[PDB]
Symmetry: D2
Subunit: 308 residues, 4 copies
């Protein structure tokens, strides 16, 4: 099993990632850490807890950074709605976050570990960067980082930048210069996972708590992702990181030297990816290129069925 | 006919553009202006003159800027050789450049015109930017600018930037903020025109001075373009601008808001292209997307046969 | 009494600041927080504890950030020596740091307070920035921040930047946009406190533990500050913040709009101070202009005598 | 005699510089080149011509760049008025610009020379930068550049930048990296030349065409320089360059390594001056520190009296 800490900002696709991570036998989900991103932390926290309660997921949830490390905070309410998880309606929330701050949880867990834990950040990298600079000794302890973020081609939130990186470019600069093994599921790969109405229907047919939740969630971003970016369905970007850890053969990556641009201006938060190797620098990232969607959606269905 | 001034840094594909522009009846080639780029100006001027002499092109050639407007000069000898036009071997040069500087030629020609002239820049944009800032009254007199440069995806000389723009980002910023009708044949489009051995063979069979010249030229970049960028043949990037003016239906463009990034750093000289229209700014550029290569190679052959 | 938290990177002048803050009856020193700066944290922590043990200061010391929030770490060993506090030799260390992290201490103390605590950063601003972004609710709780850092004219570490800001420009950007009442003792003011041989001799004559310590400390930077910068003596930069809080009439400030430049390049970490108000923006900082050095050295001697 | 070409954007103090340069026997004024700056070129050219006609100065005037090389044009109408030279009255213009563009004039004159000509730029550096990049062979021909621009301390138009540099930072970058001997009369020096009401009265008493002109001109900026920058009189910044060439002993300079910041942001167009030599780079500029104003105003009076 791959031990993971899932760091997220739920978030529609974050919820699908949580659903898969908490169920699949190849993943050992140690804890969920929450960061500000898609919405403010008060909301992404409530959203994370709501998902865990509904799916009866037995994993502690820790609240982290409510703001990025330097920049003026942005949100993605255009895609995710005022709540950050518009669509599903939950019973009154009874579970709460742990007392320990996510940054402390991340540091303490890594330091006490035998170096076998993978971090899976699928929101802005704020928690990760603060942990890395607060306790540099965590670096040798990180097995790998499999993050959803970035784009080698076109961004979403700006032409140059994908949201997670754009929401905290300085934190991304920290992570991308950490020297830790990195896998980047960028938009070039993740936009392939558009969740069209026939995919939603497939998960509805499977049914149960996860099938119902999948439908209520993914129907919302069907509209917003089309209206904003022209996508044929809402991608489940964040779930690709979980897929990658369950079976990396389903995903083609290419090793590249990647740099995060922190210049104010038209490329702030861009992941500059040396696809042709022209800079002659050692690769630092496995960059996602293609995903086998037949495999991927089969895996999603299998996880959904696990909750029946 | 479309009247043009062809501004170039020959340069293998520049030579092919010259060959096409000077021959096709849909183009009225008024003058050739030369800029430093692929090689230093002493070399690109000699290369331009050698090509015109070989093909008996009786169009005046004017020498322009030997250095970019602000940055430290770069060259592309890795692609184009120490001469800037390795491959063909020419007879002793008898023609000479005009005494009028290219910048003065461009300004004077536009100022005296009926507003029907198109600028076709296929090197760094140094001559164009100096002309625009030296005599801003040319702007309302320019019909269109159809330039080869930029990339909405991956660059060549760097991951972020295409060579022409990279060689003078500040000049490019001038041109891209000019407000003049702009067409951009960037690498995304032009990399489709890889001149593979079968395409060279085709032009060899057409024969004559242009067919032989085509072969001697494009066989050289066949090797360097593969070594540097993995390309299956050397693209004839600059010739796409001439093709566009001959028949724009052969090339699909998309209107986009494009900005040139002049920040020192990993995106210096990037053309940032808003493919999805997320910035909510009006388009300023028709950006090349796809080219019909059957049409394009047919047109190249037609022009080649014109010199028989 | 003004309640303070002293955040520092000892550091020769930090030690003088600690000596004054812990002894003057107008200061209520709640706690000392340590940051990486002049040297790595393992060292500035040891230096801070050494000074507290030597002078029998019974204030808790908390260790904070070992690295800046984003940039590559720099140190000032050129000025401060290999240990960070070259000069004095101390008896074996028995004094211990608290187990609580400085960031958590800062946040909890502020949150539990009645808004009457002043922060006094005299190192890089890493601890402060992390606290502000980790718990934004601390902002209304901060009475004032009186920091040593920046320069409106010439920097030290670079022509543009003073060391504390240069060592963490991104953290400084956080602090200077916080909206909290701000006082900046910059180099323009603090270079006025050159500790010349006659000043040292004055403190030697006062004697006792603090007088010996002052001599052993300030004799070191006497040499390093002259060799590296213009300086006739080592300034006691950080002690000016303590002086300011004891009697602000001893220092002339001017209210200015101040911005921290985070651009890579020749002004990275510059504090841009709008001396003439040309930007038309509301002031956010009281910037130090002149200090009454007779008043100041008198105050130092008084504090030194307090340890006899 | 020192042969000069005076490149300017008249401009109140430019006019005083022209008056001195054309009269003092220590200067051989070859030509006046005009650039856009204080106002658009149409206005600065008329202003320059008006001054020459009024004072019967028989020196050719050449019109140059009407826009900076890259940035969006700014003007200083707040200081110089809508005309760029509000204050004096002129008879109908009979004088006109020469037919040769200033950039060509500068190049041709330098290339034909024995290397003994000094350039005296007292506006934005647009003409100079275009000349340097258009014909790099001019570099060794330039004896010295004595420019009015920059500031090692506080700017005027912004806190970071002096107007001439700010109006074309990219051109200034070109000039400051040229390797030509450079003297920089920056604001730190030139602000010492405030033309208070008693100085104006002194020149009125001298009388003649130049005394009357001096008064009409300097009474205008007396008002604007006070309102904008709090200055006690309008400085005659540009005239200090002519003073420097008449008797350099009247001015104290310090050799420094100077870099022009071309970063967009709060230091765009700053001259970063390494006062303390901390960068370990060889000096490239003699930076003005102080001027003997008793000497200087005596020289101004002597020049004024020359026109009686
Ligand atoms: Ca997410
Ligand atoms: Ca070319
Ligand atoms: Ca300190
Ligand atoms: Ca001027």
């Amino acid at each position: 099993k791959r031990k993971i800490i899932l760091d997220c900002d739920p978030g529609h696709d974050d919820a699908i990632a949580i659903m898969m991570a908490a169920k699949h036998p190849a993943i050992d989900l140690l804890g969920i850490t929450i960061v500000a991103g898609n919405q403010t932390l008060d909301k992404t926290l409530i959203n994370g807890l709501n998902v865990c309660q509904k799916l009866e997921i037995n994993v502690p949830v820790y609240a982290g950074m409510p703001q990025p490390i330097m920049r003026q905070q942005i949100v993605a309410d255009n895609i995710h709605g005022d709540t950050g998880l518009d669509g599903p309606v939950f019973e009154p929330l009874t579970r709460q976050a742990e007392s320990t701050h996510a940054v402390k949880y991340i540091i303490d867990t890594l330091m006490a570990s035998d170096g076998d834990i993978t971090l899976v950040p699928v929101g802005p990298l704020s928690n990760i960067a603060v942990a890395m600079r607060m306790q540099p000794a965590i670096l040798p302890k990180i097995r790998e980082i499999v993050l959803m973020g970035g784009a080698y081609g076109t961004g979403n939130f700006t032409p140059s930048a994908e949201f997670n990186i754009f929401a905290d470019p300085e934190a991304a600069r920290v992570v991308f210069t950490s020297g830790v093994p990195l896998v980047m599921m960028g938009l070039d790969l993740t936009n392939q996972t558009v969740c069209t109405p026939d995919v939603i229907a497939r998960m509805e047919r499977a049914g149960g708590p996860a099938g119902e939740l999948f439908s209520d969630i993914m129907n919302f971003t069907l509209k917003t992702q089309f209206e904003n970016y022209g996508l044929a369905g809402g991608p489940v970007h964040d779930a690709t990181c979980i897929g990658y850890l369950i079976n990396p053969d389903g995903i083609k990556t290419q090793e590249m030297y990647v740099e995060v641009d922190v210049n104010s201006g038209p490329c702030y938060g861009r992941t500059v990816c040396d696809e042709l190797g022209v800079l002659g620098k050692p690769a630092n990232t496995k960059v996602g290129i293609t995903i086998d969607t037949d495999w991927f959606w089969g895996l999603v269905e299998e996880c959904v069925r696990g909750y029946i």
